[PDB]
Amino acid sequence: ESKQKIHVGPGELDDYYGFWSGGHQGEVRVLGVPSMRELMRIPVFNVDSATGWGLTNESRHIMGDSAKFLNGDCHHPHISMTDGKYDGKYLFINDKANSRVARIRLDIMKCDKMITVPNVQAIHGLRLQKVPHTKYVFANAEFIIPHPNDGKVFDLQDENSYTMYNAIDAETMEMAFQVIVDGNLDNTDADYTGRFAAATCYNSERDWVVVFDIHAVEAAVKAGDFITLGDSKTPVLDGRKKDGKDSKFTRYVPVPKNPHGCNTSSDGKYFIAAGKLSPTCSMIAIDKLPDLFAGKLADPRDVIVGEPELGLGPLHTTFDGRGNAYTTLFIDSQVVKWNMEEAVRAYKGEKVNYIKQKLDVHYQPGHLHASLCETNEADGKWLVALSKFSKDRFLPVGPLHPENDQLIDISGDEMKLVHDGPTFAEPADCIMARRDQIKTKKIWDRNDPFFAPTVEMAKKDGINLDTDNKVIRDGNKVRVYMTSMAPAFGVQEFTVKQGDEVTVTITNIDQIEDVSHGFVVVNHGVSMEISPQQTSSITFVADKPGLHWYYCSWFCHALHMEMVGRMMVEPA
Amino acid sequence: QKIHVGPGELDDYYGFWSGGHQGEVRVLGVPSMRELMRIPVFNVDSATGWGLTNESRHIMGDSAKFLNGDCHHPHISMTDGKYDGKYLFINDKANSRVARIRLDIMKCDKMITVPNVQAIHGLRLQKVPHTKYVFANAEFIIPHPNDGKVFDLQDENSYTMYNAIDAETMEMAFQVIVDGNLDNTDADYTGRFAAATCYNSEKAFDLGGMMRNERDWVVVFDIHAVEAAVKAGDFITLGDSKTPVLDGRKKDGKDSKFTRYVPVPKNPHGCNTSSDGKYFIAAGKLSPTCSMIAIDKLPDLFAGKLADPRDVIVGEPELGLGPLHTTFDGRGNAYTTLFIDSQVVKWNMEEAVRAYKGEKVNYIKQKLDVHYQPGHLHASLCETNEADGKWLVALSKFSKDRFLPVGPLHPENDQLIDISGDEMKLVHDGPTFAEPADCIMARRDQIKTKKIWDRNDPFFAPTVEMAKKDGINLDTDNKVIRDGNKVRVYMTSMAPAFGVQEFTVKQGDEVTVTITNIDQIEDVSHGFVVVNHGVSMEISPQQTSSITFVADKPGLHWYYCSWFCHALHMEMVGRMMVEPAWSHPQFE
């Protein structure tokens, strides 16, 4: 019987972390499960006024040249794994708008690395290698473009127009390799060995899921059998068909129809491709892929071992670890629970009903996610279905509507809907982790790589950031270094010339957890947060003569209103 | 009382939350405490394009160059002392602005940078006869002019000002120079009086200086006297601003016609009008008290019928350590946050008044522990004469261990408290991001929203005007207008297709894309993202939205609809083709 408690009362704690995509708003959100309350927002592709992400020197360093963009469009959050289990080190997420992948460090809950994927447009599908650990982040570029894209050729049917499958080194956040494919890439997942990955493709009665022999790709890179594109040193391999001949790197498995979701069962047996236009899912037996690539099978369709008929508009699939799959039906507006091995037997002709239950959801579900579903520890406790049209499920709030993320108890034989959670800007997908899988820092380490370049800059100025309160003058450049301890800035006044470029570096030397300080320069567009033992810095030009106040934004003390300072700007 | 809202049940109240240091406004359902919408205001929102679109940057004016805000005080317009659901207003302390949100479309529709001031903090609205004025405090003392020759806060031309904004036009109405500084503010239930707390009567810049005086004050404004002087032309102007400026400073101990200074301890903070209209209540902060100013004694005070400004104080209850803010249940009780003691204290106002007259009576009814260090608190409808005494939200600054650990930056703790009975009851801990200062609640039936835009909505009326000069009918046209190195693309959109699915420009062209969502079904929103150009916006049904960007990269560049709108949403795409600069006339 499904009967878990969903109420988390005052003083009680949630059981799981939920990491929500921020959708078209560009951030990552940390929720508590089952309360579904948002505990934290992690800025990634958005500019965050509160913490200064996008404004501070540390954040703009991480974003690189892409710091010039104020937008992102993220969909697919995933947590790094060791031996097919979450290891709590990193979260990765895509940006479809400006073609990026970001890495979030789960000990500090901040984006610490970001890469613009070269020579592609629109990073959409994204998932992680599971075994032996997350060595690679796999990322789909959705849209076919010319190569080179220099304006001579616009023809998408040209022999050099294509998109590519992308592998990023998870630990260094540099590109590992790219594989040219036929068609457009949609979603992707990986197996439980490290040898294989797979992606649904459209555009090309039948499209396909393309399967990658990552071992074969790696071997070619080690031997130097690759090309490069443009000014990127990324190894590029050709996984397209040539005159009907297969690459060593890819096999194309025909699947109906404009397939969408591409999900690996937690027992490692199947890549399950959701049918979308076809009221089916297609089940690819991962154990038959070695024979496929070895040329031992008569037809790529022979790796298909199941094609259950589920209902109208299957989009995504998740797993309870008990042998059931759960699939969103976008048109029927349902989650369907079905037994995978019974579907496999049905495909062989046995009369057996693999469908267990259909639960109405509200309305038009897209992604769905069961707790630990991407790991061999899938625990079958909670399911979230992320529905696009909330209609009358919440109070009206004008022409824009919230997404409806519905929490469903799957611990028993029958799915039970227990909570409707409204969300902003269409998160699309989420991922859950056990409380004990996530370990966070209470206070920053003074050696943290997040602000190590700022420590380096201070070193060149002869500054001990833990103690110093000093103003360095360097032509028209002014570098203010200060400590802060509630309720006082360590430098409470400084004077500059109009036009000077001012950098303010603040080190919070409070040692009590949770005592954040802020720094805002009034009417200059300057804002940032500094947590205990963090160093943060921000650069702006003092283009206005006169007295200009700065203040601590984050309530830190009974005397917070009075934690202020003055920048005095002498006229030109 | 219904505390938990099940699937298919609806919340009973709207909550409008300050976005804190993040710069937006949030719409919550109460009592579920779930977030139903984010309304971008001072922040740049990737999802809707606020801060990127031409419509939003036009509303922000020159301040569109700032990517940050710091907002604290959301309040809803009123008619005869009750919410009328028309507008919400909120401050920006970071870049000295006031913004207006239209509650029918749930969008910021007007914004103003307040002239000749720094840091708009306290903000509240006239209640009676209606919200004609938005009252806003500028917190920091600055030189006038602030041209860099004088930096001294003690100079006779160094001061801050109280600001009144015309709520309907969102232009400045007047400003009143005050002594000291300004913290929080509220208005009475007659229209004559407003009041503000001051913590820097010392006009200092160091912590010790700002704490020296035993008493600062709440400054009371005679708005009738201010309006009379404006109509008589008895005012000045500062800089290039035409705003009437009135001098509310004391001159050698002589009061101005516009202000009275009521001594109040000490660095007081909250300034709250009781729902029965009897009191301005100032929270003592460094003093363990609140001071109760009797509004019905203010006409006598301005008429010289009182010898001491302290004579308008009729209560000063001792409550606890660090009183910051007070709210009201409409049953005669006040509720005050104690920041240091970390509690909400319930007390009877009329019994506190009798205690001030010497009658020993225990006006304190209950102290409820909160978690931890509460700042603002708000009871449902507390700002109106309909204060209903049902829900109370206390907004605490340090959540410590009340939620799962999330790293060095913690959420804040907004705690929902049942006050419908004699005993305050803590029912829900709500984590929030970026420290919302205050919130405001309204009954479900006090808010009326549109599901479909009107084609003449002023929000995009300037875009309609621009289209007309190109001979465009936005409801039907799919056209590419060329004008030198500018390209103006106009298209309708109807799921799952953009009306213009490709267009060609020259490298360096300045491209404006204007999209009119001609779907007429509720909640079919479209998006528009140009890949790798930093371009993103939303277009809701019957809205026109536009965005301008430079086509700085040659080659083919995809654009796509970001908001899921249709089963074939992934087909709602298009292509911009950019011919290379070397194939066109060369400039430098």
Ligand code: CUA
């Ligand atoms: Cu430091 Cu508030």
Ligand code: CUA
């Ligand atoms: Cu229009 Cu999705």
Ligand SMILES: [Ca+2]
């Ligand atoms: Ca003082």
Ligand SMILES: [Cl-]
């Ligand atoms: Cl998927």
Ligand SMILES: [Cl-]
């Ligand atoms: Cl207040």
Ligand code: NA
């Ligand atoms: Na990088």
Ligand code: NA
């Ligand atoms: Na304006």
Ligand SMILES: [Zn+2]
């Ligand atoms: Zn997706």
Ligand SMILES: [Zn+2]
């Ligand atoms: Zn999907």
Ligand SMILES: [Zn+2]
């Ligand atoms: Zn306050």
